Amino acid sequence: KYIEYPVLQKILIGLILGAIVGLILGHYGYADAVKTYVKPFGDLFVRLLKMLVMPIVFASLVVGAASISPARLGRVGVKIVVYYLLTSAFAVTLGIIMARLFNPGAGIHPLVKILLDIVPTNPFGALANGQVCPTIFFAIILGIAITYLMNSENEKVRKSAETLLDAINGLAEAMYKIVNGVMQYAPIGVFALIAYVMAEQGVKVVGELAKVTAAVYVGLTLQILLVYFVLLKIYGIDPISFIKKAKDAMLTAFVTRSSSGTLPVTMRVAKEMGISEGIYSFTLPLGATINMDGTALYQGVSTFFIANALGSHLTVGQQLTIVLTAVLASICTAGVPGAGAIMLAMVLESVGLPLTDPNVAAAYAMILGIDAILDMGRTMVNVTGDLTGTAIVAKTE
Amino acid sequence: KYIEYPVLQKILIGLILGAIVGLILGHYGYADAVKTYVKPFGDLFVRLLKMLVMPIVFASLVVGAASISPARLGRVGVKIVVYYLLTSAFAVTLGIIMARLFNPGAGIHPLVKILLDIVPTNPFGALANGQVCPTIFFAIILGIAITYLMNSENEKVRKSAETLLDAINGLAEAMYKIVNGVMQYAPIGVFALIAYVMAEQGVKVVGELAKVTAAVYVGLTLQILLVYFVLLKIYGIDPISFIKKAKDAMLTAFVTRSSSGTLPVTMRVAKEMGISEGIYSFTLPLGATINMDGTALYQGVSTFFIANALGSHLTVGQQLTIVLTAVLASICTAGVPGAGAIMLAMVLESVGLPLTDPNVAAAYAMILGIDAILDMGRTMVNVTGDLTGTAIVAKTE
Amino acid sequence: KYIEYPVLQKILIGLILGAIVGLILGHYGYADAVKTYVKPFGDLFVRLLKMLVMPIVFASLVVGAASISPARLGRVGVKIVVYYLLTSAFAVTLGIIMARLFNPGAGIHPLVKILLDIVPTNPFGALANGQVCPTIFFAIILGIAITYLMNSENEKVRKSAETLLDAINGLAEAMYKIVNGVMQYAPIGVFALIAYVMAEQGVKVVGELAKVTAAVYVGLTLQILLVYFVLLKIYGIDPISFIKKAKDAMLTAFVTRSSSGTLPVTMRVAKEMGISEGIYSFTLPLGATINMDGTALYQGVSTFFIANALGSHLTVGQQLTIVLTAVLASICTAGVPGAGAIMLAMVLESVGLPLTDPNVAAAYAMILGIDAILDMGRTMVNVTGDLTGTAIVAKTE
Ligand SMILES: N[C@@H](CC(=O)O)C(=O)O
Ligand SMILES: N[C@@H](CC(=O)O)C(=O)O
Ligand SMILES: N[C@@H](CC(=O)O)C(=O)O
């Protein structure tokens, strides 16, 4: 076939052309037709991303945890989890500071229960029709168990364990190649998605919301620079050299709006920059789904936007409430386009702002449009976080 | 045990005796009692057919697609799919012609969205509690992927892929033997089913609906003769010799009301008449669930019946609407007794006739009774279609 | 780590201390605080028990049935099933006799369809989000099939079958070690559970309900003694010697409120007392979920309690109705804490007493409290039943 260029170049070309077409059709009546024809081609991409998420989450964990002995798992797991949560908190507070400084959108005027829920009442049921988190719990559990079995004395169960582990590993590999296949469609789909967005955008009225956009972007960039360079220089990594390798991943994640299709590319990058394989094999897929701190910063800023549009004022307690809820709601989120808004609703209802009130609903719609733009940034920052965290831990050894 | 005859003979005997008993009890008060005692024995058969459908659909596809290299898959797949759809359209239009000629039942007076839906938003979720079509998509996908893995260079993933494929294949084989087991119950169950039908039937009032029945049967027989003999003689097969082998399958499918229990018998027939194994292994289970064109012709005729009972008149556009909708709704259907009526409702609501209106509901009930008779014919024609299509393609090589 | 004692000792210590703390805090205002802090630690145990139930039911059956040839399966299966049902009936009638004698709680004033339901309309769907019983049916089916395949002549399918069976067996083993892991948490959780119960209990008012409690306990103890000693002496087992081994299992089952975590300990006990392995491997996990006759006796007694609180009088027909319904509803039940009450509702609605009427609802709440106490007894008697039944059958050979 004739599509033979390398992937990222293809996607970039598609993005560019889609933006141009969206603008020039925006001026004229064709701005309507594009909805009917183009959007279907876009949605077909989105769905293909959701499909591949669920199998890669379960399987890849099970293999990863199985490969490592339990003690080493203890050490690496605690280090990494501590780092993940701390950085997420740092990110959302940085976002709140940005919101306070810019003050966007002024316009015109069970807390234990959720921590208990993480344990699956039923594994198959939660796996098929339920949530991400419980599958993570069950996967790690099963991996540890299979390890102990492989040490066992009796050959019968030893052979059984080996073959089970091999089956699950096979499922994982297959899903990765499926991802490559989807990326070939990705240029066409990206073209469609961005074209519809640009055609709906009216620039100068969007200019008011652009103050929101500026707050968000400045927050994201500040996070990258400040946090990751400070940490890398404390532990002793040359940041520009790290970013050199990261750049491929970050580009792929910026143009595509998946935190998950990026995963195999990320693992290639990890193999290139010479890291102990098992460590990244375990930590990276866990990170792909926990390290959505960019989405956390966004959620904080948007919570402040909606609050400012409603006109409320927040105590220290309510701002702490935002912070904690945002961490947990980010952990609950799933790695696919647009999802961050659906979880933003969770945190809003936590703080006490109803999604069904029409005034705030209108403001929310305004934000939902620009969410498509902000999504690209969020994804870039997420993959950055993954790579940095793994590199740090590996440097400690 | 004492049931030792060959299967088809057993089923035929059961059918005959059940019909006789239904008639002679129909004359007298016992016509009531049979509902309570006999129907339960019948339902227990129906359920056993549904159970075995879902696993054989998924598994058998995955193995089939895995066995064949991708290029050959391209060629055979496109040929077969084109043929399937074309013949389905031919069938439903033939049915509309029959309806126009006989004019039965006069009595007394998202289109893209569904094509998008075929992609599963979640594979496990759609597999367990969702539809047929998406499992087909995902199965084919997974098979292709496993093929590429088996070519891969690295032994670890090679062994993993092999073992996964073997597991799935094992599930398939087991389900086939389960089918044989169910067929042993089938004589008893067929006896029950047909007895209840005959006991409910009042012959002379059914005589008016018998004009509907005659239209349907004449349509089916005309389809067999005209379409399949024309095609076979174009490509160069002796039709009576083909039908000789087909006869076993067609009988088994006529007496039993499953398009799926017939599948193993069909594959035996394919092995007998000497066909390239991989080709039929892939094309036949796909055909078992797509080639329900007999049900398509029925759905067209019944749509015209309901329309004539409502008294409406149909433009060229609405008749085209019937045709297209019928193709897609047949593809959505599942291979078990009585299902065709449930999908008939889909096409009716598509054309714009509400199922909840009482007048048309009464007419629909009249048709639902005779649906049990017509089901047998539909199934015969379906298996005919499967065998013919595979034979044609194999003849082209 | 510092928790190094043997399990049962740990659990006993936890139970004791939790009871004491519950009482002494009960006197004072702290009786309130314990709800908030302690209950969460308790629930986290309960959920972990539910999780592990569903996988061990399916997998362990499939392996068991696969190991044994079909003929031997016929013999052992019929013997065991007959025994299970007969003893369940004996138990519930004994309970009704006890209820008549004590007359507790006087206070102040589809039957075929469910038997048909056992067959799964969809296997994956019933497995993930549906019930226990259909998974049992499908599991046994699949096991038999895999056996025949292993006899088959063709090596390809032979290898496939072997590998499938090995996968499923691996899942089983892993789940057993998970059970051990949960038991380490069990002491802490038991402490919490019992403490909350004791803190809610007001002793002297509970003294009236204690007449209910006495009826129940006397019934249970009478069942053990009379039934099992009569049977053991008929077939020729020294009862005290049997109970010697049983004692470990019965203690573990009394302190823990799971009929399922006890299963591996039970199988250890079976290996100790020298029984043919395959026989107990099949019969014991089937028994773990069918032999809940202690819960059956309780359900009968509680049905009479609620009836006496409503003030109704029961014919011979209605008492037979209770008996039959109780057998089936016990079979439907699942092996986890508190479940017996939820199925008690099924039998109540069967007899015709509505759960939504407030008077009987109040009485039901009174019983629901003490259900936590009675649960321990039920579980002890259940594991006794399992061991005795297997021992009897093995003695016949
Ligand atoms: N869906 C994005 C992040 C987000 O916007 O929530 C990803 O994980 O790839
Ligand atoms: N259920 C039939 C066809 C139909 O009547 O819809 C079959 O596929 O066997
Ligand atoms: N849930 C208990 C019995 C019951 O109380 O229903 C068990 O099976 O362990």
- DSSP state letters, B137-200: HHHHHHHHHHHHHHH-S-HHHHHHHHHHHHHHHHHHHHHHHHHHHHHHHHHHHHHHHHHHHHHH
Q: Using an 8 Å Cβ cutoff, are C105 and C310 in contact? A: no
Taking only Cα atoms into account, the Rg of chain A, rounded to an integer number of angstroms, comes to: 22
Which amino acid type is present at position C279?
A: I
| CA pair distance A220, A298, nearest whole angstrom | 9
Sequence ranges of the binding site of A: 257-259, 287, 289, 291, 295, 333, 336, 375, 382, 386
| CA pair distance C99, C89, nearest whole angstrom | 15
| CA pair distance A160, A158, nearest whole angstrom | 5
Which amino acid type is present at position C185?
A: Y
What is the distance in angstroms between the CA of the first residue and the CA of the last residue of chain B?
47
Q: Using an 8 Å Cβ cutoff, are B63 and B147 in contact? A: no
| CA pair distance B91, B97, nearest whole angstrom | 10
Residue C167 forms contact with A (CB below 8 Å): yes
Q: Which residues, including other chains, have CB under 8 Å from residue A73's CB and lie 6 or more apart?
A: A65, A144, A282
**Among C115, C122, C169, the residue to mutate for chain B (most B Cβ within 10 A):** C122
User: b vs e for A359-378, b when ≥16 Cβ sit within 10 Å of the residue's Cβ?
Assistant: ebeebbebbeebbbbbbbbb
Q: Using an 8 Å Cβ cutoff, are B71 and B208 in contact? A: no
What six digits make up the tokens of A251? Answer: 């580009």
Q: Using an 8 Å Cβ cutoff, are C390 and C231 in contact? A: no
Q: Which residues, including other chains, have CB under 8 Å from residue A108's CB and lie 6 or more apart?
A: none
Q: Using an 8 Å Cβ cutoff, are C130 and B128 in contact? A: no
Residue C122 forms contact with B (CB below 8 Å): yes
What six digits make up the tokens of C349? Answer: 């609605």
Probe residue for ligand 3, chosen from C379, C380, C383 as the CB with the greatest number of ligand atoms within 8 Å: C379
Question: Which of C116, C119, C149 has its CB closest to that of B51?
Answer: C119
What six digits make up the tokens of A274? Answer: 């010479």
Tell how far the Cα of A226 is from the centroid of ligand 2, in angstroms. Answer: 65
| CA pair distance A264, A346, nearest whole angstrom | 30
Q: Report DSSP state, residue B5.
A: S
Tell how far the Cα of A61 is from the centroid of ligand 3, in angstroms. Answer: 33
Helices B132-151 & B277-290 angle (0-180, nearest 10)? 160
Q: What experiment produced this structure?
A: cryo-EM
Q: Using an 8 Å Cβ cutoff, are A389 and A80 in contact? A: yes
Q: How many Cβ atoms are within 10 Å of C352's Cβ, its own excluded?
A: 9
| CA pair distance B111, C48, nearest whole angstrom | 46
The DSSP annotation for C13-76 comes to: HHHHHHHHHHHHHHTSTHHHHHHHHHHHHHHHHHHHHHHHHHHHHHHHHHHHHHHS-HHHHHHH
| CA pair distance C36, C203, nearest whole angstrom | 22
Residue C129 forms contact with A (CB below 8 Å): yes
Which amino acid type is present at position A34?
A: V
- In the three-class reduction of DSSP (H, G, I as helix; E, B as strand; rest coil), residue B363 is classed as helix
How far is Cα of residue C13 from the mean position of the Cα atoms in its chain?
A: 24
Domains and CATH numbers, chain C: 7-396 (1.10.3860.10)
Q: In chain A, which residues have their Cβ closer than 8 Å to the Cβ of C55?
A: 123-124
**Closest-CA residue to A86 (of A238, A298, A290, A285):** A290
Quote the Cα angle for B287-B292-B298, to 5°: 170
Per this entry, what is the length of chain B? 397
| CA pair distance A224, B46, nearest whole angstrom | 62
Atom of ligand 3 nearest to the CA of C337: 1
User: b vs e for A253-287, b when ≥16 Cβ sit within 10 Å of the residue's Cβ?
Assistant: bbbbbbbbbbbbbbbebbeebebeeebbbbbbbbb
| CA pair distance C214, C101, nearest whole angstrom | 12
Q: Whose CA is nearest to atom 6 of ligand 2?
A: B340
Sign of CA dihedral B226, B227, B228, B231: positive
- In the three-class reduction of DSSP (H, G, I as helix; E, B as strand; rest coil), residue B299 is classed as helix
Q: Using an 8 Å Cβ cutoff, are A252 and A8 in contact? A: yes
Q: Which residues, including other chains, have CB under 8 Å from residue B32's CB and lie 6 or more apart?
A: none
How far is Cα of residue B248 from the mean position of the Cα atoms in its chain?
A: 17
With breaks defined as C to next N over 2.5 Å, after which residues does chain A break? Answer: 109
H or E element in which residue A92 lies? helix A70-102
What six digits make up the tokens of A380? Answer: 């870039």
Q: In chain A, which residues have their Cβ closer than 8 Å to the Cβ of C139?
A: none
Q: How many CA atoms lie within 13 A of C143 on its CB side?
A: 23
**Closest-CA residue to C99 (of C239, C261, C283, C307):** C307
How far is Cα of residue A342 from the mean position of the Cα atoms in its chain?
A: 13
Q: Which residues, including other chains, have CB under 8 Å from residue A250's CB and lie 6 or more apart?
A: A380, A383, A384
Q: How far does C172 lie from chain B, in Å, by closest CA?
A: 16
Tell how far the Cα of C99 is from the centroid of ligand 3, in angstroms. Answer: 21
**Closest-CA residue to A284 (of A264, A298, A257):** A264
Q: In chain C, which residues have their Cβ closer than 8 Å to the Cβ of B170?
A: 146, 149, 157, 160-161, 163-165
Q: In chain B, which residues have their Cβ closer than 8 Å to the Cβ of C141?
A: 178
What six digits make up the tokens of C150? Answer: 């292993």
Resolution in angstroms comes to 3.9
Q: Which residues, including other chains, have CB under 8 Å from residue C363's CB and lie 6 or more apart?
A: C105, C107, C305, C306, C309, C310
Cβ of residue A87 lying under 6 Å from some atom of ligand 1: no
The DSSP annotation for A309-322 comes to: HHT----HHHHHHH
Cβ of residue A330 lying under 6 Å from some atom of ligand 1: no
Q: How many Cβ atoms are within 10 Å of A341's Cβ, its own excluded?
A: 18
Residue B127 forms contact with C (CB below 8 Å): yes
Q: Which residues, including other chains, have CB under 8 Å from residue C299's CB and lie 6 or more apart?
A: C92, C326, C329, C330, C340, C343, C344, C347
How far is Cα of residue A234 from the mean position of the Cα atoms in its chain?
A: 26
Q: Using an 8 Å Cβ cutoff, are A361 and A317 in contact? A: no
**Closest-CA residue to C377 (of C185, C223, C238, C230):** C223
Q: Which residues, including other chains, have CB under 8 Å from residue B117's CB and lie 6 or more apart?
A: B133, B134
Quote the Cα angle for A310-A311-A317, to 5°: 100
Q: How far does A76 lie from chain C, in Å, by closest CA?
A: 19
Q: Using an 8 Å Cβ cutoff, are C99 and C300 in contact? A: yes
Q: Which residues, including other chains, have CB under 8 Å from residue B342's CB and lie 6 or more apart?
A: none
Atom of ligand 3 nearest to the CA of C253: 9
Q: Whose CA is nearest to atom 1 of ligand 2?
A: B336
| CA pair distance C287, C87, nearest whole angstrom | 12
Q: Using an 8 Å Cβ cutoff, are B297 and B89 in contact? A: no
What six digits make up the tokens of A245? Answer: 């390798």
- Surface-to-core class of residue A69, CB atoms within 10 Å of its CB (0-12 exposed, 13-18 middle, 19+ buried): exposed
| CA pair distance A340, A363, nearest whole angstrom | 16
Q: Report DSSP state, residue B90.
A: H
Which parts of B209-334 are beta strand (E)? none
Per this entry, what is the length of chain C? 397
